[PDB]
C-alpha cells in the first residue's frame, strides 16, 4: 500500500480549504483529528512519501492564517510534549517559529509557560538533526515570545544549554 498511502494524505487537504465554512461547531472537530495525521505521512520512511506529503501540510496553514489561527496552534503544541520520533518532532518545529509572530499578545502569556518544559527536553536530545532546527527557532520564538517572561523563568533556561556545551 505504498502507492495507496500517497493518495490518502492529499485528499484530506483539499476538502478543508474548499469547505468555505469556518468557526463552526461542526468545523472545529474535524481539524483536530486529521492534523496530527499529516505528520505520520512524513514519519513513514520513504522519500516518495516523505517529500510528497510534507509540502501538502503547508497548503493548510497559509490558507488558514487569517481564519483559524487559535485552532491551528493548539494541536501543534501537543506534539512537542508527546516528544515523538526524531523525524516526526523535527518537521513540526519549522512550523512553530514562523507562527510565533502571528499570535496575539492577549493569548501569548499562556503560550510562554508551557514551552519551557518542552524546550528543555529537546535540548537534552542527542540526535544531531533535532538539535539543528532549534538553533533556527530559538532565534525566532524567543524574539516574539521574549518580553513576556520574568526574571525567574529565563534563569532556568540558560543553565541547560551550557550543559549542552559539554
Amino acid at each position: 500500500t505504498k502507492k495507496d498511502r500517497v493518495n490518502h494524505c492529499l485528499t484530506i487537504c483539499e476538502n478543508i480549504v474548499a469547505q468555505s465554512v469556518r468557526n463552526s461547531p461542526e468545523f472545529q472537530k474535524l481539524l483536530g483529528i486529521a492534523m496530527e495525521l499529516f505528520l505520520l505521512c512524513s514519519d513513514d520512511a520513504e522519500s516518495d512519501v516523505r517529500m510528497v506529503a510534507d509540502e501538502c501540510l503547508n497548503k493548510v496553514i497559509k490558507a488558514l492564517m487569517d481564519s483559524n489561527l487559535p485552532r491551528l496552534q493548539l494541536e501543534l503544541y501537543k506534539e512537542i510534549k508527546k516528544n515523538g520520533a526524531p523525524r516526526s518532532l523535527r518537521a513540526a518545529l519549522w512550523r512553530f517559529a514562523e507562527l510565533a509572530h502571528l499570535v496575539r499578545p492577549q493569548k501569548c502569556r499562556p503560550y510562554l509557560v508551557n514551552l519551557l518544559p518542552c524546550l528543555t527536553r529537546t535540548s537534552k536530545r542527542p540526535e544531531e538533526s533535532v538539535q539543528e532546527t532549534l538553533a533556527a527557532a530559538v532565534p525566532k520564538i524567543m524574539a516574539s515570545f521574549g518580553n513576556f517572561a520574568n526574571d525567574n523563568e529565563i534563569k532556568v533556561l540558560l543553565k541547560a544549554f551550557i550543559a549542552n556545551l559539554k
Partner: protein, 171 residues
C-alpha cells in the same frame, strides 16, 4: 486599504569660493537676528475591522487607524458598530500592553493611536483622553518613542483648534 483610503477621497471630491565658504553663510546669520528683534464600502469596511483585533504585524495596524480618521471627518455616521461598541473597546486594552511593555512594535503605532481618539470626541471624551497619556510617561518606556509622539496629536488638536475648555489647558 491604501487602495481603499484614496478612492473615498475622490468619491467625495477630495558663486566663487568667497560666496560658498563665507559670504553666502555669513548673511543667513545676520538676517535672522533682525527678525529676532521682532455605500458599496459596507461589505468591504466591515472586513477590515476583524483584521485589527487578530493581526500582529504593526505595519498593518498603522494603515487601519488612518482609514477611520477619514470616516469621521467625512461624516459617515457611527454605524460601523451598529449595536455595540466592539471596536472602541479594543483600543483601550492596547494601552495596557505598552506601559508594562508587553507589546512588540508600539513605536510605529503610538503616533497614530492617539489621532483616532481625539477626533471622535467632537461627536471617549477629552477628560478621558488625557488620563491615558499620563500612564505611558511615568509608568512605562522612554520618551522619544512613546511619550513625546503621544502629544503631537493632542496639542495640535487642542491648542490650535467655554469654561470646560479652560481647565484642560492648564493640565
Amino acid at each position: 486599504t491604501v487602495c481603499v483610503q484614496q478612492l473615498l477621497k475622490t468619491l467625495f471630491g477630495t558663486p566663487g569660493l568667497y560666496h560658498y565658504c563665507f559670504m553666502a553663510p555669513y548673511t543667513h546669520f545676520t538676517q535672522a537676528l533682525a527678525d529676532a528683534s521682532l455605500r458599496l464600502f459596507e461589505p468591504l469596511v466591515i472586513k477590515a475591522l476583524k483584521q485589527y483585533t487578530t493581526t500582529t504585524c504593526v505595519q498593518l495596524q498603522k494603515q487601519v487607524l488612518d482609514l477611520l480618521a477619514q470616516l469621521v471627518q467625512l461624516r459617515v455616521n457611527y454605524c460601523l458598530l451598529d449595536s455595540d461598541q466592539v471596536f472602541i473597546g479594543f483600543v483601550l486594552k492596547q494601552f495596557e500592553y505598552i506601559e508594562v511593555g508587553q507589546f512588540r512594535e508600539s513605536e510605529a503605532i503610538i503616533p497614530n493611536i492617539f489621532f483616532f481618539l481625539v477626533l471622535l470626541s467632537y461627536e471617549i471624551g477629552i477628560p478621558k483622553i488625557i488620563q491615558l497619556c499620563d500612564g505611558i510617561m511615568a509608568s512605562g518606556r522612554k520618551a522619544v518613542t512613546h511619550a513625546i509622539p503621544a502629544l503631537q496629536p493632542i496639542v495640535h488638536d487642542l491648542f490650535v483648534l467655554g469654561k470646560e475648555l479652560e481647565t484642560q489647558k492648564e493640565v
